[PDB]
Amino acid sequence: MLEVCIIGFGFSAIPLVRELARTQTEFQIISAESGSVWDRLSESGRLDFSLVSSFQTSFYSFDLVRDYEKDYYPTAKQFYEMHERWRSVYEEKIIRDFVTKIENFKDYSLISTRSGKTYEAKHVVLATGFDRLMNTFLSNFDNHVSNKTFVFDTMGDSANLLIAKLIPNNNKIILRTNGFTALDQEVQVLGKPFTLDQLESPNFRYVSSELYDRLMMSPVYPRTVNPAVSYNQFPLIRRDFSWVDSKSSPPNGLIAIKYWPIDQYYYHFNDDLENYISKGYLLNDIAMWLHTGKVILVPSDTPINFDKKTITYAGIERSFHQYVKGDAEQPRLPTILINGETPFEYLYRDTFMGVIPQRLNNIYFLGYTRPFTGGLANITEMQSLFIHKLITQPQFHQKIHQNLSKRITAYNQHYYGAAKPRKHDHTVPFGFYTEDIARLIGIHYQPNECRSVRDLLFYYAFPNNAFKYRLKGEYAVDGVDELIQKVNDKHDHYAQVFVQALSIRNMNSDEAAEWDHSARRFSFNDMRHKEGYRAFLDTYLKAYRQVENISVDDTVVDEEWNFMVKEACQVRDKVAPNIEEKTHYSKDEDVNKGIRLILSILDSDISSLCKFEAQSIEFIRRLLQPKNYELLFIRES
Ligand SMILES: Cc1cc2nc3c(=O)[nH]c(=O)nc-3n(C[C@H](O)[C@H](O)[C@H](O)COP(=O)(O)OP(=O)(O)OC[C@H]3O[C@@H](n4cnc5c(N)ncnc54)[C@H](O)[C@@H]3O)c2cc1C
Ligand SMILES: N[C@@H](Cc1c[nH]c2ccc(Br)cc12)C(=O)O
């Protein structure tokens, strides 16, 4: 009897196969000869973009311990080459066939394949990925189209990538929108660059869900009246968040687009633009597109005549060249039969942690949970440890399964409340999910075991990447000690993030929203740092066209478009003139002050510790006994 069968080998399965090989657990992989989108993109020479996720959250711990030297955003090519490197290590373990059906019984499954062969296995792991409509569109996109108008009914990372490829050829973009959430993928902290995933300090939720909400959600919800933020200059960007019913913020089910702000793009790539573009580093600053009018937002009910290919807005019947509507990703699951008779219906909220479907036995799903920020690696690495322990330790399997339905019910009450199941339920804050798995497995850290301020910085402020939980214990990886030390030294031990939570501890949500936007450059969608980059943008467009070997006529003035832009930016034109220079910027000052205190007490025992220093030490001491630490779905009762 085959112990483990893994169906699908791309990226999500790598960490599980590593752990199964380590324990010499019998396993067999079955993965299709076709491959993944990355294979198709590679064969067509379309790996010409970059990840929207940081290196430290997008590659696995056992690679980072060898290759991590700085924070950066990998290219699609680098990502695919890592997929291939690991495929080559385990190819001998891969049967190249396509699973068509899985018959599930009480203690084993019967696996059917297109070739006609059948397999039996006690444990079956699905890591088959998702089908996505936009994938084929990106695979067939002619990036030389020029001087055309495009209408988008959906916004997302894939749409934003297409928009980044259309903008340089003088194409005009109309977003027919009911809002979207976009976030600078890299931000300045006291002028220093930080990927957004580095500044989430998720474990502060344990201090207070309200405190963590104040600290995180002002860039998403319209909480500040600051005229420099994009959702006040372009109100059509605001989404209807009436569905949210959980007290855990950021809520499960929230999705965001991560993009290069032009000021950080300039900082990294200005000295070698053509090469960086050719490597896949494309400027996709949606806020800059709105600022310059190259993209406009129009109401969702703006009428479209699909026969005549026109859209009517601002009293203008505007011809358009192409309409783009993305679809919903759907899991690539084969037929699964409960008790070998009843077809299984996949529902994220009816699985535990996105991994254990409670209607099946010894079947696990790997790679179907999506991170709100950061790369999938954080999620699939922790899922792989979870699945590995379930497969190889019967006592853990029983501890989790004995009260499975009760665990799922408690999880859904905590993260979704009374909200009805949504399409995006499978999206989770990565620092909540990794910490949830760590506590289930037992490789978590305990806040009450911190002894020094430095220990508290590590517990609360050091990002909950998967490798954080692989320094000690059951799933320890050699070299993680040096990795953690390097990450700490290059991030000032995450004191700046720790200080943020400290600065807003006594504020309400409105006061926190204003404080988060009181910096000279606040983290997300700061419209004060766009106009100064118009000249660089022209330089960038010239470089992009040279790379793609296209000539574009930028002489013809599109008066019609200028008219539509003026209509679409009426609010911006009323709001932006209210921006005022200030003498002091509270967030910049409070952070600078806090960092000086923390580093002055870094190696001090927590028990040994004007007024700000006194009140801050008091808050720090309470961090040893957080009052919101309970997660009911962790218990076995
Ligand atoms: C355009 C795009 C950009 C992305 N950018 C990022 C990013 O910046 N950062 C990030 O972290 N993630 C990103 N992702 C997500 C993630 O990195 C990829 O989706 C990744 O390919 C998912 O890995 P996987 O192993 O789960 O799926 P896949 O890579 O699709 O692997 C699934 C494999 O299983 C095979 N298979 C499927 N069904 C069967 C079957 N029935 N029988 C046998 N074999 C089967 C498939 O052929 C394939 O080889 C992006 C995804 C897309 C589409
Ligand atoms: N106050 C934090 C907010 C923050 C930092 N990183 C984030 C990622 C997603 C979301 Br939503 C919010 C954040 C900051 O601006 O550094």
Numbering used by the authors: 1 to 609, 628 to 655
Pull verbatim passages from the article behind this deposition.
The flavin-dependent halogenase (FDH) AetF successively brominates tryptophan at C5 and C7 to generate 5,7-dibromotryptophan. In contrast to the well studied two-component tryptophan halogenases, AetF is a single-component flavoprotein monooxygenase. A large domain tightly binds the cofactor flavin adenine dinucleotide (FAD), while the small domain responsible for binding the nicotinamide adenine dinucleotide (NADP) is unoccupied. About half of the protein forms additional structural elements containing the tryptophan binding site.
Structure determination was straightforward for non-substrate-bound (empty AetF) and 5-Br-Trp-bound AetF (AetF–5-Br-Trp). These crystals were isomorphous to each other and scaled in space groups P41 or P43 without signs of twinning or translational noncrystallographic symmetry (tNCS). The structure of AetF co-crystallized with 5-Br-Trp was phased by the difference Fourier method. In the case of 5-Br-Trp, the position of the Br atom could be unambiguously determined based on the anomalous difference density. The indole moiety of 5-Br-Trp lies in the same plane as that of Trp but is flipped around an axis formed by C3 and C6, the positions of which are almost unchanged, while N1, C2, C5 and C7 are rotated by ∼180° around this axis. The indole moiety of 5-Br-Trp is surrounded by the same hydrophobic (Leu183, Leu196, Met216, Pro219, Phe373 and Phe524) and polar (Glu200 and Thr373) residues as that of Trp, but its NH group now forms a hydrogen bond to the carbonyl of Leu196 instead of Met216. The side chain of Gln500, which binds both the amino and the carboxy group of Trp, rearranges and its amide group flips so that it can again form hydrogen bonds to both the amino and carboxy groups of 5-Br-Trp. The flipped binding pose of 5-Br-Trp leads to an almost congruent position of the C atoms that will be halogenated in the two substrates. C5 of Trp and C7 of 5-Br-Trp are less than 0.5 Å apart when overlaying the two structures This suggests that C5 of Trp and C7 of 5-Br-Trp will be positioned productively relative to the catalytic residues.
